[PDB]
Amino acid sequence: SKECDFTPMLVGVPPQVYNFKRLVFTNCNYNLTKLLSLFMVNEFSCNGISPDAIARGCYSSLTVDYFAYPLSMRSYIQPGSAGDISLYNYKQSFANPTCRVLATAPANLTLTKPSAYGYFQKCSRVSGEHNSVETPLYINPGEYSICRSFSPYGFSEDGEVFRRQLTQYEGGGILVGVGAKLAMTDKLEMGFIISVQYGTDTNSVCPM
Amino acid sequence: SKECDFTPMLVGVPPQVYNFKRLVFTNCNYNLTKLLSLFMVNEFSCNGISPDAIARGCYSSLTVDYFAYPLSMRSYIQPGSAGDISLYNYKQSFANPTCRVLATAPANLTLTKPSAYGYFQKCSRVSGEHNSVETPLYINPGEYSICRSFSPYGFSEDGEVFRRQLTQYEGGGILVGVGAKLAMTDKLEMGFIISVQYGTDTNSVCPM
Amino acid sequence: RKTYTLTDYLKNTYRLKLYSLRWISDHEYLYKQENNILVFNAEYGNSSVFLENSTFDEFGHSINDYSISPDGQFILLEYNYVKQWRHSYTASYDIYDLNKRQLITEERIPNNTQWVTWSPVGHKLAYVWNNDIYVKIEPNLPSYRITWTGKEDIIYNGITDWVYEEEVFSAYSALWWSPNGTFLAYAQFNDTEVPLIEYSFYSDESLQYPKTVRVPYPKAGAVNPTVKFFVVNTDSLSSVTNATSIQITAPASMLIGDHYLCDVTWATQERISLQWLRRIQNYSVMDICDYDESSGRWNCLVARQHIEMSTTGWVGRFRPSEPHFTLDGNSFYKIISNEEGYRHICYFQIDKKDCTFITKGTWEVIGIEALTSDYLYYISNEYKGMPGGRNLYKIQLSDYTKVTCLSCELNPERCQYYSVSFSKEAKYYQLRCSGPGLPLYTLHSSVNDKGLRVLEDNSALDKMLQNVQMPSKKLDFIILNETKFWYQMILPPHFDKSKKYPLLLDVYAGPCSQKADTVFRLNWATYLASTENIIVASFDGRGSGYQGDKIMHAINRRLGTFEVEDQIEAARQFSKMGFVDNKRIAIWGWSYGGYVTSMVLGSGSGVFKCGIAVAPVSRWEYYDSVYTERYMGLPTPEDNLDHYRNSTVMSRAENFKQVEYLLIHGTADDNVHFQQSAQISKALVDVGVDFQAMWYTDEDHGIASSTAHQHIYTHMSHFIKQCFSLP
Amino acid sequence: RKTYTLTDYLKNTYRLKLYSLRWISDHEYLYKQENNILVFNAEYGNSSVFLENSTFDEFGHSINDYSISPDGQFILLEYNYVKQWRHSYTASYDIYDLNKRQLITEERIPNNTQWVTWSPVGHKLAYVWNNDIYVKIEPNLPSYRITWTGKEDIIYNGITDWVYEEEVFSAYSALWWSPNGTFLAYAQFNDTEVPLIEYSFYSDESLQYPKTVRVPYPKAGAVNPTVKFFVVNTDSLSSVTNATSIQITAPASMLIGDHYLCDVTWATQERISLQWLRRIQNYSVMDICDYDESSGRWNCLVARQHIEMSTTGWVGRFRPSEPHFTLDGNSFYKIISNEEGYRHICYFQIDKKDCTFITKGTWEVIGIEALTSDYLYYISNEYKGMPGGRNLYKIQLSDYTKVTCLSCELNPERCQYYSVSFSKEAKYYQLRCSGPGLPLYTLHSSVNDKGLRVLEDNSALDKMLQNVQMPSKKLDFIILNETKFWYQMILPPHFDKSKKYPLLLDVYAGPCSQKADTVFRLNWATYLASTENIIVASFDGRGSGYQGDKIMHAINRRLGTFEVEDQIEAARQFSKMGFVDNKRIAIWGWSYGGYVTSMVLGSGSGVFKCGIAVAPVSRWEYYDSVYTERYMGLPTPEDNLDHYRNSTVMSRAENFKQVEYLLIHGTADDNVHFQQSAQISKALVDVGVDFQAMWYTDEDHGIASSTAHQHIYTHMSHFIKQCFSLP
Ligand SMILES: *[C@@H]1O[C@H](CO)[C@@H](O[C@@H]2O[C@H](CO)[C@@H](O[C@@H]3O[C@H](CO[C@H]4O[C@H](CO[C@H]5O[C@H](CO)[C@@H](O)[C@H](O)[C@@H]5O)[C@@H](O)[C@H](O)[C@@H]4O)[C@@H](O)[C@H](O[C@H]4O[C@H](CO)[C@@H](O)[C@H](O)[C@@H]4O[C@H]4O[C@H](CO)[C@@H](O)[C@H](O)[C@@H]4O[C@H]4O[C@H](CO)[C@@H](O)[C@H](O)[C@@H]4O)[C@@H]3O)[C@H](O)[C@H]2NC(C)=O)[C@H](O)[C@H]1NC(C)=O
Ligand SMILES: *[C@@H]1O[C@H](CO)[C@@H](O[C@@H]2O[C@H](CO)[C@@H](O[C@@H]3O[C@H](CO[C@H]4O[C@H](CO)[C@@H](O)[C@H](O)[C@@H]4O)[C@@H](O)[C@H](O[C@H]4O[C@H](CO)[C@@H](O)[C@H](O)[C@@H]4O)[C@@H]3O)[C@H](O)[C@H]2NC(C)=O)[C@H](O)[C@H]1NC(C)=O
Ligand SMILES: *[C@@H]1O[C@H](CO)[C@@H](O)[C@H](O)[C@H]1NC(C)=O
Q: Name one GO molecular function term (chains C, D).
């Protein structure tokens, strides 16, 4: 049977947190212990499943969000945190059982480190008679910020200010975004959000 | 018996023509065919000995002057030439039988190429009531220019002008020198002047 | 009896006396006297000595200034003063311990320091050096470097660039301490793409090749500098790892384009108010930011933003006014232009849109001076319906209809222009009356507004001035189109209204200017009247402030149109009064007055025989962005370029063939560059207009060197006396 | 009858006529007339038409100039002229074929070309572009690039830097063709370490931020530029590999320190003469170099060097004179200062040290004009013992005692100042008489010195001038310490020596100047005399040339000492003559005259009421090295710094309290920088001296713009009329 292909997470420059990538694994078999052992995990926090058991269960569909995330900012990603990072970059969805993995990648891993860490520290929409009305734009859990289009791959410097007008499909107005740039680290620090589901053909995704 | 050590000619940066180096070989045995075959000779011009026979004779003392010399300026070193190079840099002595060797050095030879070729295009001494008297200083055959002290290893640029006062041992006055800088070439081009002598223990320096 | 000669003015032979004091508590203040600082008891008046200047006979350097810490334990000594611009300068600094009575020599403040300031309470120091901010908790301890990004002429941490210093903040510093000294808020400026003005500086005889000075200076429409705002916690500074500055961004209604930071006002120990202004300066926003103790950052709620925009012109007189918060910081008082067009006090709430005007009328509140829980103290030009005066009122916060004037009728003959200085709880207040009579400084107690004692009454000058023929000041108004336009007249002594005097029009006419007030002045006009029998007159026409927005905003996007005509009409009104010789009417001005003086002389009105313009603006595209754009917009075909073109002095060069003109400018003028006058002289020569010029070597905008200030006013006096056939 | 008004001078209503001609052979010349070039037969006078200007009605650009090739096959057309400095400029160039009557469009000369020149015979071209030299054998063929090292403001191949252009060569080019056009000799200049002068340039109204101009300019004592000399064979130019330039070094008696290249004179087709000058300009050497056909290089023999040094001052009048070689080039004639102190012709041999003076007397040979095998033609100031005149003599080479004046008594009343232009074999010569009468151009034939015909006699002006009251020119001398010091006086019409006129001293006093000559001039002095009844006078004191070295070298290392006193004494001599009102004596000067005018006014002599100085030198350390050091040495404590200090105008600022002073200077002066006048105004203000100033925007040293030239002389006229109470 097909083995769940975890390659895209392990090659090249991993995406920034606000512009993350996801992999729906449907109808394949997985070895998750192998996946996590390639890195060195500093956090493995699971909500709605014991972390032991997620490597063992059979799921209708397993999803994984991956992105580059410094262990420096661990507290801003904990469930129910109040940072710009859960307002404007990434918010964990708890409708399905989920697992949060914060890991450092070794030198002898095939991932390339991006220039620096970045995240949006402001994302709000300007409308009104004289562009007087500011309307902050917070993300729904597990969805993408509209600001990620401004600069998908990172920020040249700290405090980058962006703006553009929103098409009438986007609902008019002027979108404004500000980007914080955090300096990079010694070894690449990465974040993984693993979601699972049960239901139609619960056996579609089973371990090895 | 001791073998005539031709190593100093073959290592490092060879001297400039005006600041050449010489090797008196007394009481050793030599293989000259080996020496010349390390290079690729473009001129082998002997005056007072057939070039064939100089590799075979037995000499009281063999001397060799070596220096870096472009084949571009071959005509200025021919016997009785009128260039600045025989006035101010080097002049072949014919009192003893001698051989002139102009050769290109291969890439796989242990010599390092100096930055460029250089030679003095003016060397004259200034004296008089108001430094009015100029007295050009031409070299006697096989001797060194007094200007070589100004810049022994080469010239940073073309037309370098030098001056200094001459100590009362040197006979007063102000020495003035001008240096021509010729651009260097693809492979190192070198010059050898081999002089021999006969007399006291004519067998001191014999072939192999 | 003698007359007030030019030598009297230029050599300061009739000096005024002041009374300057720092309130160090709510019932004490410091006053220096014979170099020995004295600490007065505000209530009783018994004053012991704080510090005697002979302490520093040992110092070895000439001390420009001193600054005693709020806790009184240390004194900051300033020396090696080197002026940069209007406000900026560099100097070296020594901290002297007052308790140990010793100079501190560990971890000394560096040389060439750009700004120093104590914490508002205690003895912390914040100083700027190489465009970087350093915090010094104890004067004998190492500094904590806050910013690492300072760069000459590029990045300014904690200090202003040229245009923010001059046209926005009117100060060098971009430092704002928290009220109890916990937080240090600061601005960062970035002139990376701002064009440089370049002018020759010749120093002295010795310097063989002149310096070329290069100053980042955005002229009209150019690239403006960009500004960021930060807050740092000065209590949590660690010496092992670098300190964090939390950025505060501007509201998104400002990030959509170029903007300015125009006000920073702390409300509480954990709340700060910022005001931002669009580059088109008819829309401003106040952001109110609370410090989040659980994330360490600052939350500025959108529901707490406050939009102050104008539909007839620019926001504020020169900038949006500052807010005066209550103690709890949940409400604030602020001067706003009301629905009628007059500036009055409004009472906002931090989270509610509307405000309540607590004053109203056909007058303007000049400024909010003090605010207690029971009373709000303000200064306005309401008394006798005179915009030229100033008086101190207090309003009862429990009943806005009960208002009390505290300075109106103290001495209404001599005293009509008042400024005030309150104690730290507003328990006592010092009134300063600048005119029309000799200045008078007095103390009062706020609980009863009781007049305690006279501080300085200038009677020393009063006895001196008896032996000299002083001129008198007529202040009145004329009505044009049923609007009162005010004017003043320095009338020579023994003025005879049946005689026809020559007149000299002293003009500024800048937006929101006021050259017709009640203030007492000894200046060049006093010489011209007392000694040379010349009527000096000033006029406040369209564009002049303090008279309502209908008058002040009348020149919006039309600089050099109405205020130029109105000064010509003022001359006509004066000439038809009768006591003015219309053959001899002149005009003179300095910065906007120089611009207007030249425009008037190029107007071809035939009214003025001669005029003299120092350091004048000639084309508004040559002046800085913040000021010019406030009134003119951008010089683009889409915005206002057509009037930018049709407002130049050079355009009028033909019409100087009728007048006698004198053009004066300093060769090292950082503000109204010598370029401006260079272009006028070019234009006059191309059209074949003869005129007189005078360049002042290495001089700045307001010529301040002693020898040059004497020389200019001497030269100008000869020009006026030649123009009037005066002896 | 009317008077010669200022408008007559400024609008050129009484124009002089010239007769300019290029001798294209030994018996033909070119003359342009109504834009149509005419070729005259020198002997007979019958003149057919060379080229009609309507040929270029098709061209489409305004043509500044034309230059027909020596062979007459091509014409070089100049347009897009852009002046750089006194001599330098850039322009675009088109070559028009005269035979095919077509414009050449293959391989066109680039734009912004700095110098172009034909070969002396034929149609080769040498042009400089981006400081690099290009040779163009055929006008329709590709250029051969000679030099690859040209760099803006750093390396100059074939053209001069600022100071070589202005103070050494008096020309932009550093190109010297071989006599038959085989060799192209050129100089290379290297300003790598020369300091830059920087001044503001404001262009026009549109330019928002001014340009800052930066020009490599060595002031007194600074780093001088360094010079190299090369020769290239233009016949052996190959298009496959780059061309060789053979360097010619200076003699070692020059390489021991800083030096200058001051003369390049080809002797034969294979021999060239170079003259080098020590930076201390009292020692020069001529190097004579023959081309070695067997090595391709150039041999300059030491036995052929020629040392020309001076013991009382600097070598030459402004530079060592040029040699006039014989045909074979083995001997040459050259003007030398003889043992008596007078400049006369010496006859050197290329390989023999001594020379033979062929002229001698108490007069100077001004220049060698032509040299045939039988006669040498020279110009001297010998006639009537007048240094102020010029006359053409020829000397017989077979007998140096036989000398003939060819211009003395042609018309000795009207004509006393002559210049000449010979044909290519000196078979005919055109005399030009510049004064005292109206200019007169005539043709002559050398074999008999026969007067052939009158070319231009200015009788058109003569009839015009009948209806106007012209002033007269008195030229005389006075004796001080038994030395004749000459002077001139523009006397108003109907001059009455029993009346006492105001006087205005027109002063230059520069080393080797001569302001007292016989030349005819219509200028500002003519206005001042004819219309304003003012005697304008000039004087030639110590330092003035053409009167011997005892007079000219009298100011050596002491600029601003004797010539300043001597101009004051001249005023005293004139005032005690009687017809001069000593209440009204003024003084005016421009470059060294401006320096002397200021020095005289700061002298405290009490002699001059008022003075006006345009673009004046104020301190000699501000002026360029080559000129200042020629007369002053170096400003080091070892050489002359003490007098460099004690010769400044700023030192005398106190003594302007007695005089009325007007200071005028251009803001874009590349030569006497505005710095100089800026320092004077500074000094006057610090000492509290009132004066009048006038800056001229974007103007150079000799103010040449039409509007500014009119404006200045109008302003100056008002100053003099005010100073004399004139109507
Ligand atoms: C237009 O005019 C300009 C101004 O007049 C001209 O510009 C000048 O050009 C000359 C050369 O023509 C330069 O001199 C050379 O400078 C070299 C480095 O200079 C750089 O640094 C300058 C700072 O000034 C100080 O700093 C350097 C430190 O590196 C110091 O050495 C130097 O002396 C000076 O005090 C900076 O301002 C410059 O811009 C440069 O970037 C310097 O190394 C040269 O010394 C050389 O050459 C001389 C004579 O040739 C010898 O006596 C020295 O010993 C030394 O020789 C070594 O290096 C040479 C290569 O350059 C080789 O030829 C030699 O073989 C030798 O190498 C061996 O020798 C070593 C011992 O010396 C051994 O230990 C090694 O093992 C090596 O084997 C020389 O001083 C001027 O600096 C330059 N000035 C300016 C302002 O630019 C310009 O040329 C003119 N242009 C035209 C087109 O006309
Ligand atoms: C402008 O002025 C220059 C000189 O400044 C003239 O240039 C010289 O012109 C002469 C012609 O009169 C040239 O001399 C002749 O050269 C012939 C040989 O030419 C080549 O020779 C060798 C090749 O083997 C090359 O190395 C060399 O460079 C030449 O390319 C000779 O045959 C001639 O000599 C004959 O006459 C003499 C007596 O006069 C006899 O003794 C000889 O044996 C022989 O019979 C002759 O010498 C000379 O080479 C040119 N030199 C240079 C540097 O240019 C220009 O001609 C002149 N141009 C104009 C338009 O006026
Ligand atoms: C030098 O190197 C060449 C190859 O590049 C080789 O053929 C030759 O034999 C070598 N000679 C010596 C002396 O190393």
A: serine-type peptidase activity
